[PDB]
Design an enzyme around this catalytic site. Structure first.
Site, PDB file in Angstrom:
ATOM      1  CG  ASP A  35      -1.775   1.179   1.401  1.00  0.00           C
ATOM      2  OD1 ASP A  35      -1.922   1.954   0.431  1.00  0.00           O
ATOM      3  OD2 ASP A  35      -2.348   1.333   2.509  1.00  0.00           O
ATOM      4  CB  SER A 199      -2.075  14.037 -13.724  1.00  0.00           C
ATOM      5  OG  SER A 199      -2.473  13.767 -15.056  1.00  0.00           O
TER       6      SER A 199
HETATM    7  N1  LIG Z   1      -4.095   3.914   0.727  1.00  0.00           N
HETATM    8  C1  LIG Z   1      -4.498   4.174   1.980  1.00  0.00           C
HETATM    9  N2  LIG Z   1      -4.089   3.459   2.974  1.00  0.00           N
HETATM   10  S1  LIG Z   1      -5.570   5.527   2.298  1.00  0.00           S
HETATM   11  C2  LIG Z   1      -5.994   6.136   0.636  1.00  0.00           C
HETATM   12  C3  LIG Z   1      -7.072   7.170   0.892  1.00  0.00           C
HETATM   13  C4  LIG Z   1      -8.418   6.814   0.778  1.00  0.00           C
HETATM   14  C5  LIG Z   1      -9.420   7.731   1.048  1.00  0.00           C
HETATM   15  C6  LIG Z   1      -9.103   9.010   1.436  1.00  0.00           C
HETATM   16  C7  LIG Z   1      -7.781   9.394   1.547  1.00  0.00           C
HETATM   17  C8  LIG Z   1      -6.784   8.470   1.271  1.00  0.00           C
HETATM   18 CL1  LIG Z   1      -5.134   8.991   1.408  1.00  0.00          CL
END
Ligand SMILES: N=C(N)SCc1ccccc1Cl
Length: 330
Positions: A35, A199
Site C-alpha cells: 500500500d 498529472s
Molecule cells: N491507501 C491508503 N491506505 S488511504 C488512501 C485514501 C483513501 C481515502 C481518502 C484518503 C486516502 Cl489517502
C-alpha cells in the site's frame, strides 16, 4: 541488494493485490497488501481477537526466534473505506522477494474491523508511503522500504500491476524489459506523507487531450481512480445509460456497455487506461448494472491514482534524496 516478488489479484475484479512476505525465523509467509498510501506494516496474528479472524494466515511471534516485543509501542490506523485495525508491535526479520530487512517493525493486530475479517485473502498490509505517516506510538517506525533503502542497489521500488493477471514489485532496480518506450519522471511532494504528484491532464476515449493540473497520490492500496467531479462527469457522459447513483455510492453503467479508454498525462507523456480496466462488474450478483472504475474524489479531499490507473503503467517510486515518480507504458 535487490528483491523481486509477484503480486496477485485477490479476485476476478482486481479488487486488491497480495504479495507473499516472509516474517520471522523460521519464516512465516503471509500475503500482504502493498500500500503506497500508508506506512504501517501490520499483520493478523496470534494476538488478534479470535472472532475477528476468519481464514487469514496469522503471524505468531512466539514461534519466531528473532521476534522481540517493542516495549510500550502501540498502533492504530484507518483506511479510505472506514475500516481500521490496531495493536502492539514486534521487531523481526522481514523478507520480500529475496530482500531481507532485520529489525523491521511488525505491527501485530489485536483488533481489526469487519471488512478485514471478512476478507480471508489479505493477511495484513505493507505500507510504502513515507515513514512520517507511520502510526506507531510513542516512537514512530520506518517502512520496509526506508529500512531497506541504504542496502539497495538503487533507492527505488517499482510497481507493475496486472490487469486480471499477476504482476511484480521490484526493490532496488528498474527492470528495463518490463515496459515499452521511456519512463517519464515527475516531481513529488512529500508534505502530506504520500507519493503526491501532478498529472498534466486527461482525455476520454479518442477525444482531445485537456491540459489541466490534477494533484493526486499514487496509491497501490486504493482499487479505483478518484478524480475531480468535472473530469469524472466528462468520462461517464460518453457511456450510454451511465449515471451517478447515491444509493450504490458512485457511477454505475449498463453491463452491456463498451467503455471508452481514459488517458492521463505525466509531463508530456500519456498513459492510456483501456476501457475494460474501468469495469468493476455487477453491483450485486446477477445485476445488469455495473460499477465504474473511475469515481469522483469530491468529499475525499484528494485525488487518488489507484490501481485502475497504476495497472496501466510501469511505475517507479524513486526514493532518492529528492523523491520522484516515473511512469512508462507497458
Ligand atoms: N491507501 C491508503 N491506505 S488511504 C488512501 C485514501 C483513501 C481515502 C481518502 C484518503 C486516502 Cl489517502
Amino acid at each position: 541488494s535487490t528483491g523481486s516478488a509477484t503480486t496477485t489479484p485477490i479476485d476476478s475484479l482486481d479488487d486488491a493485490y497480495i504479495t507473499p512476505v516472509q516474517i520471522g525465523t523460521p519464516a512465516q509467509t503471509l500475503n500482504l497488501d502493498f500500500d503506497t498510501g500508508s506506512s504501517d506494516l501490520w499483520v493478523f496474528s496470534s494476538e488478534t481477537t479470535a472472532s475477528e479472524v476468519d481464514g487469514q494466515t496469522i503471524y505468531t511471534p512466539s514461534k519466531s526466534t528473532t521476534a522481540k516485543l517493542l516495549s510500550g509501542a502501540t498502533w492504530s490506523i484507518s483506511y479510505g473505506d472506514g475500516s481500521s485495525s490496531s495493536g502492539d508491535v514486534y521487531t523481526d526479520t522481514v523478507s520480500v522477494g529475496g530482500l531481507t530487512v532485520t529489525g523491521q517493525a511488525v505491527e501485530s493486530a489485536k483488533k481489526v474491523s469487519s471488512s478485514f475479517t471478512e476478507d480471508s485473502t489479505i493477511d495484513g498490509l505493507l505500507g510504502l508511503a513515507f515513514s512520517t505517516l507511520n502510526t506507531v506510538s510513542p516512537t514512530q517506525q520506518k517502512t520496509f522500504f526506508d529500512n531497506a533503502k541504504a542496502s539497495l542497489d538503487s533507492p527505488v521500488f517499482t510497481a507493475d500491476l496486472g490487469y486480471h493477471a499477476p504482476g511484480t514489485y521490484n526493490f532496488g532496480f528498474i527492470d528495463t524489459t518490463a515496459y515499452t518506450g521511456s519512463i517519464t519522471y515527475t516531481a513529488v511532494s512529500t508534505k502530506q506523507g504520500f507519493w503526491e504528484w501532478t498529472s498534466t491532464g486527461y482525455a476520454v476515449g479518442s477525444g482531445t487531450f485537456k491540459s489541466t493540473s490534477i494533484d493526486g497520490i499514487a496509491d497501490t492500496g486504493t482499487t479505483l481512480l478518484y478524480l475531480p467531479a468535472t473530469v469524472v462527469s466528462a468520462y461517464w457522459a460518453q457511456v450510454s445509460g451511465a449515471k451517478s447513483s447515491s444509493s450504490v455510492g458512485g457511477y454505475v453503467f449498463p453491463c452491456s456497455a463498451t467503455l471508452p479508454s481514459f488517458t492521463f498525462g505525466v509531463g508530456s507523456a500519456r498513459i492510456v487506461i483501456p476501457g475494460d480496466y474501468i469495469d468493476f462488474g455487477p453491483i450485486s450478483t446477477g445485476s445488469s448494472s455495473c460499477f465504474g472504475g473511475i469515481q469522483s474524489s469530491a468529499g475525499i479531499g484528494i485525488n487518488i491514482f489507484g490501481d485502475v490507473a497504476l495497472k496501466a503503467a510501469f511505475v517507479v517510486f524513486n526514493g532518492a534524496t529528492t523523491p520522484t515518480l516515473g511512469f512508462a507504458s507497458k
